[PDB]
Design a protein around this ligand. Structure first.
Ligand SMILES: COc1cc2c(NC3CCN(C(C)C)CC3)nc(C3CCCCC3)nc2cc1OCCCN1CCCC1
Ligand SMILES: COc1cc2c(NC3CCN(C(C)C)CC3)nc(C3CCCCC3)nc2cc1OCCCN1CCCC1
Ligand SMILES: [Cl-]
Ligand SMILES: [Cl-]
Ligand SMILES: [Cl-]
Ligand SMILES: [Mg+2]
Ligand SMILES: [Mg+2]
Lengths: 355, 354
C-alpha cells in the first residue's frame, strides 16, 4: 500500500510501456513510479507515472491508473460501456485494455463522504449528472429485467446458503423468518403498479462513486463526476434515484466492526427530495420549466411517490446481495449486520408509506 | 434467403429487446429477416420493420445481425467496433450480446478487384487508410504482430505432413526455397526500412471496402472500410504494401482454384504516387505547404518503404495459405494461392534488386 510486490510492479511496467505512447515507449524499468491506491484479491488500483524529470513528446499523460481484475460476457459489456463513456467524455479515458486489467485516465479528485450528499449544491449536481446518464443510448438490452432478475438471482443463492458459525446461522435464520420469497412478490405488486420510465441507470450512485474534481471546488454546478458503472443497466428511473436517497443513510468508511454506520434519520426530507428532483427534471427534459406551476407540482408529487417506493427495492436488493457476500466474500465487513440494516429500513419505510 | 426458424425467433427477440421505438411492440408475424451471408462463423442477416409500420422516433427501419457462430479477441473487436461507431468511422452499434451483435445496416456493395485502380477509388482508399492510421486505440502499440505471426505460421508449416501426390509435390517446392532463411533476410531488410508504427487494418482489399449506395456520383466520401479482424499496431508500410498486392488478386472466381492472380495488375509507380499523394496530406498536417523538393523526397522514400513491406504481405499470406491447406474448413485452392504469393515475392525481390 505504498509499493506493490515484485511481479505486479514489472507487469505494470510492460503494460505501461507497450500500451502508452510517447515517453512511455522508451522507458527503462528503473524509472517506473508505481504506488498502490487500493489493494485486495479483486480490483486492485495502482497509480503509474513518469519521473518528474522526463518531459512528454505529445499529448500522452504523465500518470495513469492501472486496474487489475484478479480471478467472458460480463467483461465484454463493461469494457464496451467504459470505452463508449470514454469517447463521449462522460468517463475517464481508456488508454489500454488487456485480459488482466486496463489502463485508465487518472482523475485528480477525492470521493465524497456520505454527509456531503445533502449539501444543496452537491445534491443539485448529482441530480443533473444522473439525469444526463439517464438520457444516454447504450447498446444493451432495453427491457427492465435487471431489477427483479437480480433480486431473484440473489434470493436463489440466499436460500442455498448454510453457515457453520453459530452467530451467522442465527442472523440468517432471522432474515429468513420474514419469508423473503413472499416479500419479494409483495414488492413486485407494488412496483408493477408504480409507473417509472426505463432509462440507462448507474444502479450504485453513492458517495464512493462520486468524484470531487481537484481545483473545481468553487464551481457551483460542475465539480463532480460519476464513476464505477459495474451495475449499470436499463432499469426503472425510480430505482436509481431511490437507491441514491437510501445512500444518504449509509457510511462505509467506519473504522470498526461492522465497518459501516446506518442512520434512518439521515434519509432526505420531502424538502431535500424536492430540491433533488427540481434539479433532475429540467436536466432530463429542458422544456420542464415552461409547464404550468400546477402541472409541475403534479409531476413532482407523482415522482416522490415513485422514487420512495423504488427505494424499497434498493433495501431488498442490496440486503440480499449482502447475505451472499457473507458466504462468498473474503473482503472483511459486517455483511450480515448490513443485511439486517437494509431489511430494518425496508420494513420501517414500508410502514411509513402505508404500503 | 429465409433463415432457420430458430434463428428467426432468436433474431426477433434480440431486435425487440435491443432496439427502441416501433421494434419494442413488433409481433413475431410482422418481423422480416433474410440471410445476407451464411457460413459457420459471422453469419449475417438483414432484419427490418414492415414497410407499412411507421417509426416512432430515430430508430432504424433495418439493421444487420451478426452471429459469431464458431476470449480476449471478442472484447478487443467489440471495443474497437464501439469506438469506430462513436467517432462516425463505422456503422453504429445497436446491440451486443454473447451470440452476436446488431449493427446499423449500410446499403452498399463491396468493390471488385478491378475497381481498386479507379483513380477516385484509389485516392479515397488512401485518405481512409491515412485516417485509420492516425486513430488512437487502447491496444498494444508494440509492432509484434507481423513477424510474430510470420514466425508462428512458419513453424506450423515446417511440421506438416500431407497425404496425396499433388499436395506433397506442391509443399515440396515451397519448402525448397528455404523459408526460414528468407524470413531472416526479410527481417533484416525490414529492420533497415524505417516505417512508422500505426493502427493498421492489415487486410485492406476490395472485399473489406464498401461503396455506399446513393454516393456513386461523389468523387470523394463514397467508401467505408470494414472488417477489422486482423487489425493491430503494425508498420504503416505493411498496410499500404498489402493493399498494393491486392490489386493482383481476385477472390471471386467461380472455378477452382477460386482466385485469379495477375502480376501485371500491381500498381505502376504513377498509380502508387497517386495513392500516396492522397494519403500523405490526410496523415500529415501541413504536407501540402512543404517545398516541392521535400514532398518529392518524402514520396520517393515512402514508395521504397511500401514496396519492401509488400514482400512481407506475400510472405505472411503465403504461409497463412499453406497452414489453411491442412486445417481447412473452406473450399479453395490454398496451395495454388500460396504458390502465386511466393512467385510474386520473388518477382518483387527482382524488381527491387534485393
Ligand atoms: C460493502 O460495501 C462497501 C464496502 C466498503 C469498504 N469496506 C472496507 C474494506 C477495508 N476493511 C478493512 C477494515 C480491512 C473495512 C471494510 N470500504 C470502502 C472505503 C475504504 C477506504 C476508506 C473509505 C471507504 N468503501 C466501501 C464501499 C462499499 O459499498 C459501496 C456501495 C455498495 N452498494 C451497496 C451494496 C453493493 C453496492
Ligand atoms: C480465401 O480466403 C477466404 C475465403 C473465404 C470463402 N471462400 C468460399 C468458401 C465457400 N466456397 C463455396 C463454393 C461454398 C466458395 C469459396 N468464403 C468465406 C465465407 C464463407 C461463407 C459464405 C461466403 C463467405 N470466407 C472466406 C474468407 C477468406 O479469407 C479468410 C478471412 C481472412 N483472410 C485473411 C487474408 C484474406 C482473408
Ligand atoms: Cl460460516
Ligand atoms: Cl411465494
Ligand atoms: Cl454517433
Ligand atoms: Mg451512502
Ligand atoms: Mg485483391
Amino acid at each position: 500500500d505504498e509499493q506493490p510486490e515484485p511481479r505486479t510492479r514489472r507487469r505494470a511496467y510492460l503494460w505501461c510501456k507497450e500500451f502508452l505512447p510517447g515517453a512511455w515507449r522508451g522507458l527503462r524499468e528503473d524509472e517506473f513510479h508505481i504506488s498502490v491506491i487500493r489493494g485486495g484479491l479483486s480490483n486492485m488500483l495502482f497509480q503509474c507515472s513518469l519521473p518528474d524529470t522526463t518531459a512528454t513528446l505529445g499529448d500522452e499523460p504523465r500518470k495513469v491508473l492501472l486496474r487489475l481484475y484478479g480471478a467472458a460476457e460480463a467483461m465484454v459489456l463493461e469494457s464496451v460501456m467504459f470505452a463508449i463513456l470514454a469517447e463521449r467524455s462522460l468517463g475517464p479515458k481508456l488508454y489500454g485494455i488487456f485480459p488482466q486489467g486496463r489502463l485508465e485516465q487518472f482523475i485528480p479528485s477525492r470521493r465524497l463522504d456520505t454527509e456531503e450528499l445533502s449539501l444543496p449544491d452537491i445534491s443539485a449536481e448529482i441530480a443533473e449528472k444522473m439525469a444526463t446518464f439517464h438520457g444516454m443510448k447504450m447498446p444493451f438490452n432495453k427491457e427492465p429485467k435487471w431489477l427483479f432478475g437480480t433480486m431473484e438471482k440473489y434470493l436463489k443463492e440466499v436460500l442455498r446458503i448454510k453457515f457453520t458459525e453459530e452467530s451467522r446461522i442465527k442472523k440468517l435464520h432471522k432474515l429468513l423468518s420474514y419469508n423473503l420469497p413472499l416479500e419479494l412478490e409483495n414488492l413486485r405488486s407494488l412496483l408493477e403498479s408504480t409507473p417509472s420510465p426505463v432509462v440507462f441507470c448507474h444502479n450504485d450512485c453513492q458517495e464512493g462513486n462520486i468524484l470531487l474534481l481537484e481545483g473545481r471546488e468553487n464551481s457551483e454546478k460542475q465539480k463532480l463526476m460519476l464513476i464505477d458503472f459495474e451495475y449499470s443497466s436499463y432499469n426503472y428511473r425510480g430505482f436509481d434515484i431511490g437507491n441514491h436517497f437510501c445512500e444518504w443513510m449509509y457510511d462505509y468508511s467506519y473504522e470498526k466492526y461492522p465497518f459501516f454506520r446506518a442512520n434512518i434519520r439521515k434519509y432526505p426530507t420531502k424538502k431535500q427530495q424536492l430540491h433533488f428532483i427540481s434539479s433532475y427534471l429540467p436536466a432530463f427534459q429542458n422544456d420542464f420549466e415552461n409547464l404550468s406551476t400546477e402541472e409541475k407540482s403534479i409531476i413532482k408529487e407523482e415522482m416522490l411517490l415513485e422514487v420512495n417506493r423504488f427505494a424499497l427495492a434498493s433495501h431488498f436488493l442490496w440486503g440480499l446481495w449482502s447475505i451472499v457476500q457473507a458466504k462468498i466474500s473474503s473482503i472483511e465487513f459486517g455483511y450480515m449486520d448490513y443485511a439486517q440494516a437494509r431489511f430494518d429500513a425496508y420494513f420501517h419505510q414500508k410502514r411509513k408509506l402505508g404500503v
